[PDB]
Nucleic acid binder design. Structure first.
Ligand SMILES: [Mg+2]
Ligand SMILES: [Mg+2]
Ligand SMILES: [Mg+2]
Ligand SMILES: [Mg+2]
Ligand SMILES: [Mg+2]
Ligand SMILES: [Mg+2]
Ligand SMILES: [Mg+2]
Ligand SMILES: [Mg+2]
Ligand SMILES: [Mg+2]
Ligand SMILES: [Mg+2]
Ligand SMILES: [Mg+2]
Ligand SMILES: [Mg+2]
Ligand SMILES: [Mg+2]
Ligand SMILES: [Mg+2]
Ligand SMILES: [Mg+2]
Ligand SMILES: [Mg+2]
Ligand SMILES: [Mg+2]
Ligand SMILES: [Mg+2]
Ligand SMILES: [Mg+2]
Ligand SMILES: [Mg+2]
Ligand SMILES: [Mg+2]
Ligand SMILES: [Zn+2]
Lengths: 97, 49, 99, 86, 122, 58, 137, 116
RNA sequence: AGAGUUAAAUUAUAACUAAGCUGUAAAAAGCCCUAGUUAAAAUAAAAUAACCCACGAAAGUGACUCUAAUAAUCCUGACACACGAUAGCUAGGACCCAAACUGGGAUUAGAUACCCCACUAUGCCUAGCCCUAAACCCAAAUAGUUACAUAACAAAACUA
RNA sequence: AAAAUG
């Protein structure tokens, strides 16, 4: 008979889930400028999840795109292109201290 | 709708008559797929340079 | 006779909702050389750092403004059946009863 | 070999400071994992040992990260006790 | 677009590139494939010195040929472009546009796994 | 961020092959390890060399 | 004073000089620092060997040439032979991970050469040739 | 052996109006000439179900499932004729044969006229 | 399962420089047709990504591209059918590198072992066999429950 | 590095 009892309904304060920087984006093997931000400038390694911060699908997609572009003749393997060297820093890795 | 979508694209296909025009047009109209990202999640283009 | 559902529906904590980034008034009830024990009043007492500006004006019983972050800092660790309770709350200092 | 030289793993010296430039270069390789890779590739490791190494490293990393998380969580209670004598 | 062809042509003069593209597209059409668009990516530095046809190549022009071709004729075109001496590297892949972009829903928070060990008192 | 632990160990409810194989149970202990003392090394071999250069030359 | 550790690639229009020469004309010091020896060879930009000195050539012996002191002495002598031909700046290229790695690098500075750039060209096969079996069976 | 024409205007673009009014360029792209093998599998399934079955809509029926798996068995035998050392698809074909035989036994036990 | 391709390293092969190179706790043996740098096919393997946990029934699989393709309107079920890591056998081809065996050099009282060097079978491709593993996650398959209830340890106790 | 037995 109490009208002030809690009602079993969905959480209204549910915050939206965090998105990877490339949620609902198109990853391509021809976009060497985009692919270069996730590779080390000095050695050329592909950064991991703890460095990039991408949700599960886009990490595998960017890895596959880098590996395809490295063999199709679009991006160097051993180093990052100096033309794309001046791109904004998306990775969370800091070398010079 | 897909049939109608392809119908529009059938006009711009490359054919024997359009070979000489399309090759020269491609040789004079370069295209670039380069685009970068930022920490906020926005796309930035090199074409404004 | 008023029922607990009725008074809990009108309790200020119910009106606050989530405790993230909420402005509350607290009163300091204990003083350490550099740490201030501020009771914002919800469940626990938060601990804050004495600022550099008007640091002498913080005494026992002083009312201050807080931006509440969490009601109670608890988290899970490896091989733990329950949480590890910190017996405190998370809040930051903004001012001292600006009125 | 097929790539252009003097681009990868190259550090430019500033004001003749070679000792610190070498430390910067060493940091580059350690944080990219090349030093451990060379020391591991010196002698071949069997896949059975590689799986064990990966499992041990992952378990150790998980334990270390959880311990660091708990330490940072409990750093707040480092303050001097005001209820001494109770 | 169904298939994409990333044609790395040898760096050479404008009429020679025009003739090479014309004959390449003629070979594409002879196998029963319709070329939808032709895109030029420009002539840039190659990422590495590619050795093909007893020649060391440092430059090269990039071209993108997207088309509709039967699954049976994909390999013959590869053999033709392999023996074509003005092509540095022929590659036929699937066009990126035929894979629809699924909703990249976001970082779903995963909790810490629990009940991995019993409740024995240590 | 902490690496995931779901579906890693071999349990009754785990349907797949175990991924991680702990030497000891992954229970967070109540004491951290004692800090390691660094191994010493010889000092100024470089200056000893220039000291002995005078002796070998003169 | 905006200084970047990234190399001055010839593709750009930067203005950096060392003794009047560009970065592309400055000689190279290839330094192979093995686990038992350290070999230093100074070649020019045109890939002409100018100076060569190694711990084995320094009058050392079997195990005494593996120490960092032998590497430093080899660097000093290689620097002397390089200065004999009139060179001021060199670019060090380190190959391999060994004990005489940094010592033979500082050997050039001790012997009278200025180091402007250090490049780590270490052989890193991406699982190519299978290396030898592990010791201590 | 069945001979599906390459210019058949495959099922996904067959029941929509105005297919015959467009030109040969569109008709060729919407045909089996530009299609993969799965499209031909669907076409063969449709053509077999329209002639062998009595109710094409009742898919959950034993005889409809038998026809559907017969299509897959023919595809697997065609794959085997090209790949001899393939053991995975050999296992798939040999297990599909047993499944079809099991359901044929069930159909013989339940509905004899349909089985014949 | 087929077809095509190779980014790093390595090597057969040429050119300049040096008298040494490799080798270990230290040595010796070996190579000085040796070593460093600049160019370089063929074979073998597939850094980082992977702090990812997906595919396949299992063994097993993570360099790239294309084709074919991953049974069952989904219970259990053999001595029947089909697979089955590495190791081994037969025929043809390949052989950078690694290495059983073997021959030298160390240590030891002895060392037909651990340490160093060289090399063979072998690891590689096609075809045909062999049908074995700590083939283990030592936890059978199918639908479930958190009720009673810790021999000990370990991955908690249990139902049809 | 080395190094057996009761
Ligand atoms: Mg499975
Ligand atoms: Mg154990
Ligand atoms: Mg322990
Ligand atoms: Mg053993
Ligand atoms: Mg094969
Ligand atoms: Mg190569
Ligand atoms: Mg050969
Ligand atoms: Mg000797
Ligand atoms: Mg690889
Ligand atoms: Mg299935
Ligand atoms: Mg069964
Ligand atoms: Mg077998
Ligand atoms: Mg064999
Ligand atoms: Mg052999
Ligand atoms: Mg050998
Ligand atoms: Mg012997
Ligand atoms: Mg196994
Ligand atoms: Mg068993
Ligand atoms: Mg069973
Ligand atoms: Mg007990
Ligand atoms: Mg005795
Ligand atoms: Zn995302």
């Amino acid at each position: 008979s109490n009208e002030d009892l809690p009602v079993p309904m969905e959480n209204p304060y549910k915050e939206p889930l965090k998105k990877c920087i490339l949620c609902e984006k198109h990853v391509d093997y021809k976009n060497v400028q985009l692919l270069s931000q996730f590779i080390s400038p000095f050695t050329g390694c592909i950064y991991g999840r703890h460095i990039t911060g991408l949700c599960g699908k886009k990490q595998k997609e960017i890895t596959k795109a880098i590996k395809r572009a490295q063999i199709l003749g679009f991006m160097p393997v051993t180093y990052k292109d100096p033309a794309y060297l001046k791109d904004p820093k998306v990775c969370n890795i800091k070398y010079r201290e | 709708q897909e049939v109608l979508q392809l119908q529009e694209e059938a006009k711009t296909f490359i054919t024997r008559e359009n070979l000489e025009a399309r090759v020269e047009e491609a040789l004079d109209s370069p295209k670039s797929y380069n685009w970068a990202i930022t920490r906020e999640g926005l796309v930035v283009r090199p074409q404004q340079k | 006779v008023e029922s607990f559902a009725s008074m809990l529906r009108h309790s200020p904590l119910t009106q606050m909702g989530p405790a993230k980034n909420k402005l509350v008034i607290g009163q300091i009830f204990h003083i350490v050389e550099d740490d201030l024990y501020i009771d914002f009043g919800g469940k626990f007492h938060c601990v804050c750092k004495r600022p550099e500006v008007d640091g002498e004006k913080y005494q026992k019983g002083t009312r201050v403004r807080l931006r509440l972050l969490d009601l109670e800092l608890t988290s899970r660790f490896l091989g733990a059946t329950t949480d590890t309770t910190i017996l405190e709350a998370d809040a930051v200092l903004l001012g001292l009863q600006e009125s | 070999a097929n790539h252009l030289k003097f681009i990868a793993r190259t550090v430019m010296v500033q004001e003749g400071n070679v000792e610190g430039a070498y430390r910067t270069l060493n940091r580059i390789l350690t944080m990219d994992g090349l030093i451990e890779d060379i020391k591991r590739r010196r002698y071949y490791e069997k896949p059975c040992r590689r799986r064990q190494r990966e499992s041990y490293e992952t378990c150790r990393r998980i334990y270390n990260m959880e311990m660091a998380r708990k330490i940072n969580f409990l750093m707040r209670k480092n303050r001097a006790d005001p209820w001494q004598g109770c | 677009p169904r298939y994409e062809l990333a044609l790395i042509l040898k760096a050479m003069q404008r009429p020679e590139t025009a003739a090479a593209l014309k004959r390449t597209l003629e070979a594409l059409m002879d196998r029963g494939a319709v070329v939808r668009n032709l895109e030029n990516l420009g002539e840039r530095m190659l990422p590495y010195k590619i050795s093909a046809h007893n020649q060391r190549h440092s430059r090269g022009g990039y071209f993108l040929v997207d088309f509709y071709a039967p699954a049976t004729t994909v390999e013959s075109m590869m053999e033709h472009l392999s023996r074509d001496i003005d092509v540095i590297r022929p590659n036929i892949v699937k066009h990126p546009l035929t894979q629809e972009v699924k909703e990249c829903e976001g970082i779903v928070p995963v909790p810490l796994e629990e009940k991995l060990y019993s409740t024995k008192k240590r | 961020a902490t690496p995931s632990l779901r579906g890693r160990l071999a349990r009754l409810g785990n349907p797949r092959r175990p991924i991680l194989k702990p030497n000891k149970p992954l229970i967070l202990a109540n004491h951290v390890g004692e800090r390691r003392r660094e191994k010493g090394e010889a000092t100024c071999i470089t200056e000893m060399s220039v000291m002995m250069a005078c002796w070998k030359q003169n | 004073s905006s200084f970047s550790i990234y190399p001055p690639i010839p593709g750009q229009e930067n203005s950096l000089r060392w003794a009047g020469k560009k970065f592309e004309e400055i000689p190279i010091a290839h330094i192979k620092a093995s686990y038992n020896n350290t070999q230093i060879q100074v070649v020019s930009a045109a890939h002409q060997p100018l100076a060569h000195a190694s711990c084995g050539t320094e009058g050392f012996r079997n195990a005494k040439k593996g120490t960092g002191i032998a590497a430093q002495t080899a660097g000093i002598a290689a620097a002397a032979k390089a200065t004999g031909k009139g060179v001021t700046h060199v670019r060090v290229v380190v190959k391999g991970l060994g004990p005489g790695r940094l010592s033979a690098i500082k050997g050039l500075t001790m012997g009278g050469l200025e180091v402007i750039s250090i490049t780590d060209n270490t052989p890193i096969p991406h699982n190519g040739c299978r290396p030898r079996k592990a010791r201590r069976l | 052996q069945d001979d599906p024409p390459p210019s058949m205007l495959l099922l996904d673009y067959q029941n929509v109006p105005g297919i015959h009014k467009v030109d040969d360029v569109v008709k060729r792209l919407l045909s089996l000439e530009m299609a993969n093998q799965k499209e031909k599998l669907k076409i063969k399934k449709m053509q077999l179900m329209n002639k062998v079955l009595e109710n094409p809509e009742d898919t959950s029926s034993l005889e409809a499932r038998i026809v559907a798996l017969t299509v897959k068995i023919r595809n697997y035998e065609e794959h085997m004729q090209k790949h001899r050392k393939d053991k995975a698809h050999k296992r798939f074909l040999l297990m599909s044969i047993d499944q079809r035989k099991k359901m044929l036994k069930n159909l013989r036990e339940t509905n004899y006229a349909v089985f014949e």
